[PDB]
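task queued by scheduler; priority normal; single chain, no ligands, no partner chains; default sampling; output format set to structure tokens
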Amino acid sequence: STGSATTTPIDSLDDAYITPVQIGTPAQTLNLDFDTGSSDLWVFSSETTASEVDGQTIYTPSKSTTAKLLSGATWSISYGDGSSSSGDVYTDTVSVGGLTVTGQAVESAKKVSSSFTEDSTIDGLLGLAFSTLNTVSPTQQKTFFDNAKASLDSPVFTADLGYHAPGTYNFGFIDTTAYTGSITYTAVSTKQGFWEWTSTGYAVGSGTFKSTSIDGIADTGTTLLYLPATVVSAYWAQVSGAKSSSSVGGYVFPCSATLPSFTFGVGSARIVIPGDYIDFGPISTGSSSCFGGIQSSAGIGINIFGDVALKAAFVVFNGATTPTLGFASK
């Protein structure tokens, strides 16, 4: 089997991407944030504190003939941006782009933090990291990908995110028409539960490539590119007027600037992030100070290849016995 679903930016800055997901019988379609940096499939629901729902579509298990309470199971998760959610658990039928899993753990939110409430376009998350990070207790649950894996033509999914445009998540096959040149595969460590890999270096604009190992995670659920302070300083040094602002919370730059590209290494291959991808616009409405899309990972504890990086590539998440990551230009 295979599946194929279109993923769409939630706003004009590509802050996140939503993908339609069918849950239950008859289908209830929710727009979820596919997140390769976590492993919980959770939704706004009929159980979510009413004051914490503001425009989201909710899952109502009592209206699904295939929903069953997973008795005694609870979940609670915190993300790297400080947001959080928690609740209880149902199993139900979940379909993505034509691909169906029966008995999928659907984590029903009782509580969500303000960041989730305020984002009316995101109805929940669908985690695609390794199931060892799943927060359901006392019985840990599997991701949609893990459950689907044995039914797939190939044990893979691919992320093809657009710049200010729709893209695609595919399950079970590699669309050879969706990328240019060859796919370069690189080793993955699952030791921390992430799609963790090592980049072979970077370049700023038309500058020379610096060979240096950068350990990080491929995370579709993170907006920006978070790299070591040395790397990020070298990038923003090439932008007149750019500076790190503690009041704003990162590097800012004059909105009048033209940003240089940023290249990262995948083995002997290179992925180029155009300068425009690194522009996240005015820090506040009408400001002439703009927020940078490359930021320091110092104090995160991990480097994160978020959407800024991933949308410049066609990315293969290979969940074979020995997992790997593949990157192609497109």
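post-processing summary
- Residues 175-330 form a domain with the Cathepsin D, subunit A; domain 1 fold (CATH 2.40.70.10).
- The radius of gyration is 20 Å.
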